[PDB]
Design a protein around this ligand. Structure first.
Ligand SMILES: O=C(Nc1ccc(I)cc1)NC1CCCCC1
Ligand SMILES: O=C(Nc1ccc(I)cc1)NC1CCCCC1
Ligand SMILES: [Mg+2]
Ligand SMILES: [Mg+2]
Lengths: 547, 547
C-alpha cells in the first residue's frame, strides 16, 4: 500500500535543527524562556517569518524584522538583551552548524531503492546572506537523492497550510493512504493526518526509523554500510576536446575546486570511476573523468604509433591547454597509472600531484629490451598474446558481454588464468560461455561497457600494448630524473598481475612518496573496494593536493 | 622572402630575464662580479646547468648542484657567501618576477597575422618546484600565440648546439634565408647566422623591433592597440548537459577558478562572448559560455511555454546541479541579462554575483499588463511584430547572411530602424539586400552565426518574446524582494533600444549596485567595445566576485 515517503529538512534530514537554536540561545544568554521563539513567530500568519517562508521577502530582509520583534518581545517581558546581540550572527552560526543526518538519508535512499517515491517537504527561505553558499551545498548534496524537493519559499505555501499538502500529493501522483510523512513538528503532521496519510513525529532518529521500518515493512535500521554514490551516464556533463585534427577526447566532469583528471586502465572507460566521481566532487574537487584515447566517445585511430606513451602524454598536455588549465592532479589506474607517472616525469609543470592505483613506477632498464623483460615474468604472457594485430581483437570482440563478465571479477571469484595464454591459444579458452555475474557489477553496468565498446572495439585499446620498444626508448630519457612532486602509490593485495611487491623500491626514485594499501582487493580496484579508494584519495588530496 | 620569425623566451618574450638575476644578486650581496655566473656555467657542456637544460635532470635536482658550484667558485675566489644564501629563494623570486614582454608579444602576433610562421626557441627546464604553477601559466599564455614552442629540456638539445637549429628549421619547414631569429645572447645567434638566417641581438625592445620592422618590412612599432584575443570554435572544450528529457544545453568552457556563466542575448550564441572568454579565463576564472536554450547546439523545442523565464531559470539551476556547482557568477547581455536578474531574485543561493550588460532591472508593474506597457514605448514596436508565430521566422530565415549583417552593426553604421516595424510590415523592409560588412565583424564570423542558426532557426529564439504575460505573473511574485547579492549594471551609451536612462532607478531595488558605462557603444556591447567590457567585468569580478 505505502508507495512514497516525504521527509522534512530541519530536524529530520538535517541536524541540529536551525529552529532549535533559539532555545539554546535563550539559555546561553540567560534570557526568558521562549523569548526568541515568540519574536520568531511574532504576528503568526501575518508575521515577518511567514512572509519570509513563502518567498515574499529574502532572509537578509528578514533579519532586520526579527531584531525588531526581539525588542518588542523583550519589551513586554521587561528584560534587556545582550550588548552585542546579533540575529545574523546567531543564524549564520546555527545554519553552518546544521549538517546532513546520515542515517536518515540512508533510510530514504533504501526506501527509494526499493521502489518508493521520495521527496523533501520543507519550509525554507531565499538565502541572500554572504554565507549562502553553505546552505546551497547542503541542499545540493541532499537534493540529488530524492525525486522531489518542495521548498515553501519556492511554491508560495507553507506547512501547516493544507494547500501545501494537496500540492504535495499532486506532485507525488499518489493518494494520502500511500504516503508516509516524517516531521519534527506535531502541528505540521496534523494536516497530513487529517488527509489520512501515515505520519511520524520525529524526535530521535532511531525511534523514528523504527516506526518507519514497522510501517513500511522494510529493514532500515542496523543495515549494512551501503556503497558510495555512483553516477548515471545521462545525468553527467559531457565534454569534448580536439587535441589534434583526428583526435578528440571525451570526459565526464563534476564538481568545483582543484582539477582532478582520472585516467582509467585497459579495457575500461570513464565509467570505471563511477564510485569516486561523486565522492571527489563532494570532497571539494573538480573531477574530469576521461575516456582515454581509443575508448568510448574518444577518438580511436587504427595506427599503433598513435598509442605510444609519448604521444598519449603530449595529447593530455594539449587537453589541459585547450581547457585552459595550467595544472591538474593526475590519478591513474592500470595503463592509466603508467601514463600519470610519465606525465609527472616529463611535465612536472603540469601535474599538481600524481597518484597511481596498482601500477608501480619502475624505471626502464637501459640494458634489457622490454620484450626480454616481459618474457621473464610468467604472469605477463598475455602481453605477448596482445602483440600480433587482430588476434586478440577477434577473441575480445566475439562476445562483448562474455568478455567483460569474464574480466571484471573479484579475487574470491573465478578470475581469469594469466599463465600460458599464448600456449593456450587464447584468453578465454578455459572460460565458460556464460560467465556468472560478479558481485562487483550489475547486469546493466556490464551492458554499459558493452555499448561503449561496440563503437571502436579493442584495436585502439590493445594498441596500448604495442609500443613496448618505443615507450622503452622514450623512458630511458628520464633515467636521470626523480619524481619530486606530491605522489601517491596505492597497492592492491590480491592483484596478481600488478602485485604490491612490484612497487617496493619506488622510494629510490620518489623519496617523498606516500602510500596506500587495500586488503582483499583485486585488479579492478575502483569497483572492488570503492569505499576504501575514496577514503584514501580524499585524505591524500586534502593533504598533498589542495594545500 | 622572409616567412618565419623565431623568438627566445628569457630576455626577449619575457622580462626581466631570469638569467639576468645572477648579476643583480652579486651586486646586491656585494659578491665578486660574475661569481654566480661562473658557478651557473660551471663545467660548460658537461656542467650541471647543461644537463638540466637538456632534460637529463629536474630543476629541484639542479638546485643542490648549483649551490655546490657556488661554493667552489667562491672558494677559488677567496670570498665567503651570505649567512642565508639560498639558490632556491633566488630563483623562485627571479622566475615569479619575470613577466610577458607585451610589445614583443604584439610584434609576434602581428607578423603571424600577416602570414608569418612563428615559434619560440628556448633553453628551459623541467620545473618540479612547489612554485612551478607560476611558470606553467606564463608558458600557457604565451604558448597559445605561436605555431611552435621548442623547449630544450623537451628535445634534448640546447642553443648554441647547431643541432637544435637544424631541428628548428626542420620544424619550420623552411630554409634559413627565410627566417628571422631574435635572442638576447650573441653566442646563440652565431649558429643561426652561420646557417645564413637573419638574426637580431635583442637588448632593448624598441631597438630590436626597429630592426625587425626594417628587415620584415611590416609596421610593428607605434602600431594601434589590437583587439583582445578571440577564440576559434574548434579549439574549445565543448560541454553538454541534459537538464530534462528533451532539453540539452551546450556551452564552451575555459579556465580555472570561480565559475562564471555567460548568457547571451537575441539572436546570438556563445560565440558572442569570443572576446571575453579568453580574457576572463586569463584573469583567473572558469568560464562557461552558454548557447542559451533555443540556440546553436542547445536544444530548441517548438512550444512557446518552453521559453518563459520561470522554466529557463529552473533549467539553469538544474544545469548547475548536474555540473556539481553550488554557485556561479551569472553575467548576461540583452535577454540573457534579463535572465540573470531573475536568477538573482529567485535563486540567490545559486548566484555568487550578478552582472548585466545593457539590460536594466525594472520590477514588474502589478497594475499594467505587459503588452500595455510595451505599446507605450515606440522603440519596442518590433516586440509586437515578434508575437505572431511564424511571421518573424520567415523574414529572419529567408536570408541568414543578410539577417546578421543587417543586425550586427555599430552605432555609427546603418543601424536598423526600430520605429514602425509592424506598420512597415517587416524588420528589413527598408534595408538593402546585400548589407555592407560591419567594422565589428569579419565575413567568417558572420558565416559562423549563419551555420549555427541553420540548425534550429528563429522559432525557439523568438519564443523568448512570447511569454510576456507569463513572465509578468511570475515576476509579480518577487515585488517584495530586493537584490542584496553583489551586482553590476553596465550601460551602453548608444544602445537605442536598451537605453541607459532605463536603469536610473535600479538602486531602489538594488542598494549596493555597482555600475559601469561605455561611451560610443551600440547594442552589441561585447563586439562593439570588447576591450572596455573585459576591463569592467574583470575589475568587478576581482573585487566583488572572487573575495
Ligand atoms: O596489463 C595490464 N592490465 C591488464 C591486462 C590484461 C587484462 I585481461 C586486464 C588488465 N596492465 C599494464 C599496465 C602498464 C604496465 C604493464 C601492465
Ligand atoms: O529586445 C531585445 N533585444 C533585441 C531586439 C531586436 C533586435 I533586431 C535585436 C535585439 N532585448 C529585450 C531584453 C528583455 C527586455 C526587453 C528587450
Ligand atoms: Mg522541521
Ligand atoms: Mg635568452
Amino acid at each position: 500500500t505505502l508507495r512514497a515517503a516525504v521527509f522534512d529538512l530541519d530536524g529530520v534530514l538535517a541536524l541540529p535543527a536551525v529552529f532549535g537554536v533559539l532555545g539554546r540561545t535563550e539559555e546561553a544568554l540567560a534570557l526568558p524562556r521562549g523569548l526568541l521563539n515568540d519574536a520568531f513567530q511574532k504576528g503568526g500568519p501575518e508575521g515577518a517569518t511567514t512572509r519570509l517562508m513563502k518567498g515574499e521577502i529574502t532572509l537578509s530582509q528578514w533579519i532586520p524584522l526579527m531584531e525588531e520583534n526581539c525588542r518588542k518581545c523583550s519589551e513586554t517581558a521587561k528584560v534587556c538583551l545582550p550588548k552585542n546581540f546579533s540575529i545574523k550572527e546567531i543564524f549564520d552560526k546555527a545554519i553552518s552548524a546544521r549538517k546532513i543526518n546520515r542515517p536518515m538519508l540512508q533510510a530514504a535512499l533504501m526506501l527509494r531503492k526499493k521502489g518508493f517515491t521520495t521527496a523533501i517537504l520543507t519550509n525554507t527561505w531565499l538565502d541572500d546572506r554572504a554565507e549562502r553558499d553553505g546552505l546551497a551545498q547542503l541542499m545540493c548534496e541532499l537534493k540529488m537523492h530524492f525525486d522531489f524537493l518542495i521548498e515553501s519559499c519556492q511554491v508560495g505555501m507553507v506547512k501547516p497550510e493544507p494547500q501545501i499538502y494537496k500540492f504535495l500529493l499532486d506532485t507525488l501522483k499518489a493518494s494520502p493512504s500511500e504516503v508516509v510523512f516524517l516531521d519534527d513538528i506535531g502541528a505540521n503532521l496534523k494536516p497530513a493526518r487529517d488527509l489520512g496519510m501515515v505520519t511520524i513525529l520525529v524526535q530521535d532518529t532511531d525511534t523514528a526509523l523504527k516506526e518507519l521500518e514497522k510501517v513500511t515493512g522494510i529493514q532500515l535500521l542496523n543495515t549494512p554500510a551501503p556503497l558510495p554514490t555512483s553516477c548515471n551516464p545521462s545525468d553527467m556533463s559531457h565534454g569534448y576536446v580536439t587535441v589534434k585534427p583526428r583526435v578528440r577526447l571525451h570526459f565526464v566532469e563534476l564538481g568545483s575546486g582543484p582539477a582532478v583528471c582520472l585516467c582509467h586502465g585497459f579495457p575500461e572507460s570513464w565509467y570505471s570511476w563511477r564510485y569516486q566521481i561523486p565522492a571527489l566532487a563532494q570532497a571539494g574537487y573538480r573531477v574530469l573523468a576521461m575516456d582515454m584515447k581509443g575508448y568510448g566517445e574518444s577518438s580511436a585511430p587504427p595506427e599503433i604509433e598513435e598509442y605510444c606513451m609519448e604521444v598519449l602524454c603530449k595529447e593530455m598536455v594539449t587537453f589541459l591547454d585547450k581547457l585552459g588549465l595550467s595544472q591538474a592532479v593526475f590519478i591513474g589506474h592500470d595503463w592509466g597509472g603508467m601514463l600519470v607517472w610519465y606525465m609527472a616525469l616529463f611535465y612536472p609543470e603540469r601535474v599538481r600531484a600524481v597518484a597511481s592505483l596498482n601500477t608501480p613506477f619502475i624505471p626502464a632498464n637501459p640494458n634489457m629490451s622490454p620484450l626480454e623483460s616481459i618474457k621473464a615474468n610468467p604472469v605477463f604472457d598475455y602481453q605477448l598474446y596482445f602483440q600480433e594485430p587482430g588476434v586478440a581483437e577477434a577473441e575480445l570482440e566475439q562476445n562483448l558481454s562474455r568478455t567483460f563478465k569474464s574480466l571484471f571479477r573479484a579475487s574470491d571469484e573465478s578470475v581469469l588464468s594469466m599463465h600460458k595464454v599464448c600456449e593456450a591459444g587464447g584468453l578465454f579458452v578455459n572460460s565458460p560461455e556464460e560467465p556468472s555475474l560478479s558481485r562487483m557489477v550489475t547486469e546493466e553496468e556490464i551492458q554499459f561497457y558493452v555499448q561503449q565498446f561496440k563503437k571502436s572495439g579493442f584495436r585502439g585499446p590493445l594498441n596500448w600494448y604495442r609500443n613496448m620498444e618505443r615507450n622503452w626508448k622514450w623512458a630511458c630519457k628520464s633515467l636521470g630524473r626523480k619524481i619530486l612532486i606530491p605522489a601517491l602509490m596505492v597497492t592492491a593485495e590480491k592483484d596478481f598481475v600488478l602485485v604490491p611487491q612490484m612497487s617496493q623500491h619506488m622510494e629510490d626514485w620518489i623519496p617523498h612518496l606516500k602510500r596506500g594499501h587495500i586488503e582483499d582487493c583485486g585488479h579492478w580496484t575502483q569497483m572492488d573496494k570503492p569505499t576504501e579508494v575514496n577514503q584514501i584519495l580524499i585524505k591524500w588530496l586534502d593533504s598533498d593536493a589542495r594545500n
